[PDB]
Amino acid sequence: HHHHHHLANTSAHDFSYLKFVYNATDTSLEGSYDYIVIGGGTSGCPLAATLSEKYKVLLLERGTIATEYPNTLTADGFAYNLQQQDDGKTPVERFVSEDGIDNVRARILGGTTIINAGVYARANISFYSQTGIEWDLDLVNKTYEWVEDAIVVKPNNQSWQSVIGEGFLEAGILPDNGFSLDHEAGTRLTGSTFDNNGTRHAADELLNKGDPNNLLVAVQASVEKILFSSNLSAIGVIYTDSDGNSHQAFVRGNGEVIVSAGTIGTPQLLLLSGVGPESYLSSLNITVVQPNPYVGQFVYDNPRNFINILPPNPIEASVVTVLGIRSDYYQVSASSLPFSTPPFSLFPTTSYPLPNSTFAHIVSQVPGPLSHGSVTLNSSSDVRIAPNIKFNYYSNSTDLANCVSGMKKLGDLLRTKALEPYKARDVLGIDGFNYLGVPLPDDASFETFCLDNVASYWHYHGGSLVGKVLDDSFRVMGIKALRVVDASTFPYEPNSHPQGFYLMLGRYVGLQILQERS
Numbered sequence: 001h002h003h004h005h006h007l008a009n010t011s012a013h014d015f016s017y018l019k020f021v022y023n024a025t026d027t028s029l030e031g032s033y034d035y036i037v038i039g040g041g042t043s044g045c046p047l048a049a050t051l052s053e054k055y056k057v058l059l060l061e062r063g064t065i066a067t068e069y070p071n072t073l074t075a076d077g078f079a080y081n082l083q084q085q086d087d088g089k090t091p092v093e094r095f096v097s098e099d100g101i102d103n104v105r106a107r108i109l110g111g112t113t114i115i116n117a118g119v120y121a122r123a124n125i126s127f128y129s130q131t132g133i134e135w136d137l138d139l140v141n142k143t144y145e146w147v148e149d150a151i152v153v154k155p156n157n158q159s160w161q162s163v164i165g166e167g168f169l170e171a172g173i174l175p176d177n178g179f180s181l182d183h184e185a186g187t188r189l190t191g192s193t194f195d196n197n198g199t200r201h202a203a204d205e206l207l208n209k210g211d212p213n214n215l216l217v218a219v220q221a222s223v224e225k226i227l228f229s230s231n232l233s234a235i236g237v238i239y240t241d242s243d244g245n246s247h248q249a250f251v252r253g254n255g256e257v258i259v260s261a262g263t264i265g266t267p268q269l270l271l272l273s274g275v276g277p278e279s280y281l282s283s284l285n286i287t288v289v290q291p292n293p294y295v296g297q298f299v300y301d302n303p304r305n306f307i308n309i310l311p312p313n314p315i316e317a318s319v320v321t322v323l324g325i326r327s328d329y330y331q332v333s334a335s336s337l338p339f340s341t342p343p344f345s346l347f348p349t350t351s352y353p354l355p356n357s358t359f360a361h362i363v364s365q366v367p368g369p370l371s372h373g374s375v376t377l378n379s380s381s382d383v384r385i386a387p388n389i390k391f392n393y394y395s396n397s398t399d400l401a402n403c404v405s406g407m408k409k410l411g412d413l414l415r416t417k418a419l420e421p422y423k424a425r426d427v428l429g430i431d432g433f434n435y436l437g438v439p440l441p442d443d444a445s446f447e448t449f450c451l452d453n454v455a456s457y458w459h460y461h462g463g464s465l466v467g468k469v470l471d472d473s474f475r476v477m478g479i480k481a482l483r484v485v486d487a488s489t490f491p492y493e494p495n496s497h498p499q500g501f502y503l504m505l506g507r508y509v510g511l512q513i514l515q516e517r518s
């Protein structure tokens with residue numbers, strides 16, 4: 001298959017880039033650069049590597065390097081990082097939305113690709129025309145291949161993923177797409193950023209494609225403020241190191257500051273810097289640099305709804321590789337060992353029953369979603385104090401209708417011959433399964449189930465939307481030399497699993513920056 005000749009193979013996680021990674025305590029990192037990228041995450045790492053092909057780049061990341069937390073480097077360690085308590089330095093930062101749903105974000109060089117579930121997919125090909133951005137579609141595809149050559153494999157067979165795939169097909173999630181990276185209706189094996197040795201590959205490895213003479217990375221660099229000219233332009237940043245001391249770095253000439261701090265971090269930093277809704281910022285006595293009513297608005301979290309089955313015989317743990325895709329729901333299942341310490345946010349609250357045997361977590365994702373909320377500041381000065389985030393799950397009735405459809409399809413899945421061997425009782429109904437937590441239930445019972453048992457899919461996005469805060473080149477409207485590139489930029493998903501899109505986007509926008517400059 002020509003289209004997959006380029007995929008990565010099994011290999012150790014490549015930390016060669018550590019040769020140009022430095023502690024933010026090093027004041028010799030202060031000074032002038034062509035580009036400053038804020039946030040060494042999913043988009044930020046390939047963006048910085050791409051810009052460094054020609055220009056001097058400083059990448060600033062608030063977390064440390066992944067070697068400090070070895071359980072981020074294997075598939076087997078996924079649960080560990082979520083189970084670990086948040087001490088302010090760990091790679092997983094815990095939060096709770098104002099809705100009451102537990103959640104996490106990354107705090108580590110590599111961003112959320114260092115802690116995530118590894119599922120790799122390209123964007124739904126209809127996404128590009130939906131946005132109305134004049135994408136260079138040939139370049140988009142070359143850029144996917146540049147990412148995939150470094151960190152994406154074709155997964156080997158896993159017994160539970162194959163069971164689930166046979167079930168999806170039997171339940172009518174057709175056609176059978178075989179192995180494919182593309183987000184299309186039907187059932188498929190997709191790519192993974194875990195290799196077939198279980199080694200995690202991630203966005204930090206794309207730093208190895210940067211020019212080591214041009215790229216500098218500062219870790220434990222907490223960026224507190226974007227600095228502006230006194231024609232409004234961004235000119236630099238203030239960041240603090242792990243000892244608390246402050247540092248300043250600037251861009252020069254035709255260079256630019258790009259914010260890649262994520263759905264949560266990018267609106268927070270813009271607001272702290274005086275870019276945002278005029279009445280809101282004035283009410284905090286933050287001087288407004290650029291009024292924009294949409295900074296931190298239109299923030300989205302696709303709902304996750306789920307059931308857990310406890311088979312009467314052990315099943316093998318698996319990472320998610322098999323996807324069942326419809327336009328109105330995206331479905332997967334993971335199989336897991338039992339645990340006595342919960343992975344935080346796997347279930348939506350800390351008071352959720354613990355599994356004492358192996359279990360299958362069977363999941364459906366609402367597309368969009370159409371419900372939205374906001375990011376607002378908790379502290380008007382301290383970037384290390386997490387902002388308030390509210391998603392307003394199921395405020396839009398279309399989301400609820402789509403959850404009902406997805407839950408009914410999970411019922412179909414539980415009724416397949418594929419899943420029958422995992423029932424505890426060989427009775428006709430799906431009550432023959434043993435359930436951890438709430439089992440599946442007319443639509444009123446499904447609506448109640450959807451509302452009561454919702455969790456985060458962890459695929460939140462928005463807050464600095466193209467068309468509201470940014471133009472089609474990802475520039476902050478009204479401000480020269482300032483862009484935003486990360487998941488804050490779009491109001492809908494590109495697909496069921498967006499890391500592949502945001503990895504591509506980092507390099508793609510970097511190439512656009514370089515081309516505009518030439």
Ligand SMILES: Cc1cc2nc3c(=O)[nH]c(=O)nc-3n(C[C@H](O)[C@H](O)[C@H](O)COP(=O)(O)OP(=O)(O)OC[C@H]3O[C@@H](n4cnc5c(N)ncnc54)[C@H](O)[C@@H]3O)c2cc1C
Pocket residue numbers: 038039040041042043044060061062063104105106107108109110111112113115116117118119120121221222223224260261262263265266269383457458459460485486487488496497498499500502
């Ligand atoms: C638990 C979990 C599992 C997931 N699993 C999958 C999956 O299997 N497949 C998939 O496709 N997607 C998955 N996702 C979603 C996907 O990984 C994310 O949507 C995507 O990685 C977000 O990229 P980003 O660049 O917007 O943010 P990030 O990758 O989080 O990058 C933002 C970076 O900015 C840093 N930062 C923030 N504020 C500052 C500041 N002030 N100064 C300096 N640095 C700062 C952060 O530390 C972070 O490294 C998962 C998400 C989670 C939470």
Ligand SMILES: *[C@@H]1O[C@H](CO)[C@@H](O[C@@H]2O[C@H](CO)[C@@H](O)[C@H](O)[C@H]2NC(C)=O)[C@H](O)[C@H]1NC(C)=O
Pocket residue numbers: 124125126127130183184185325326327328
């Ligand atoms: C791929 O993305 C497109 C969005 O651009 C989705 O298609 C739209 O949504 C529904 C599809 O049932 C229709 O009402 C719209 O008319 C569609 N628009 C276009 C231009 O086709 C589509 O559902 C997504 N596909 C998957 C499998 O998620």
Ligand SMILES: *[C@@H]1O[C@H](CO)[C@@H](O)[C@H](O)[C@H]1NC(C)=O
Pocket residue numbers: 005006007008009149150
């Ligand atoms: C993976 O192995 C194949 C074997 O055909 C090889 O051609 C390719 O160069 C390897 N991929 C990478 C990214 O090194």
Ligand SMILES: *[C@@H]1O[C@H](CO)[C@@H](O)[C@H](O)[C@H]1NC(C)=O
Pocket residue numbers: 023024025064065219220242243
């Ligand atoms: C940076 O140096 C400080 C000491 O000044 C130390 O406490 C911290 O762990 C270092 N961080 C990294 C990422 O090396």
Ligand SMILES: *[C@@H]1O[C@H](CO)[C@@H](O)[C@H](O)[C@H]1NC(C)=O
Pocket residue numbers: 122125137138141182
């Ligand atoms: C890009 O790749 C996709 C598959 O991911 C393919 O369907 C599409 O035709 C390609 N587009 C271009 C412009 O090559």
Ligand SMILES: *[C@@H]1O[C@H](CO)[C@@H](O)[C@H](O)[C@H]1NC(C)=O
Pocket residue numbers: 283284285
């Ligand atoms: C803002 O400052 C004014 C004084 O100029 C004060 O009256 C007001 O209470 C302040 N508001 C906040 C939220 O600090």
Ligand SMILES: *[C@@H]1O[C@H](CO)[C@@H](O)[C@H](O)[C@H]1NC(C)=O
Pocket residue numbers: 377378379388
């Ligand atoms: C800050 O967040 C906490 C939740 O962690 C909340 O209880 C508190 O009211 C918030 N404070 C402000 C000023 O927003």
Ligand SMILES: *[C@@H]1O[C@H](CO)[C@@H](O)[C@H](O)[C@H]1NC(C)=O
Pocket residue numbers: 370371395396397398
């Ligand atoms: C739900 O979302 C759609 C699309 O954004 C919108 O047209 C509709 O008005 C929303 N419904 C409600 C009740 O807000």
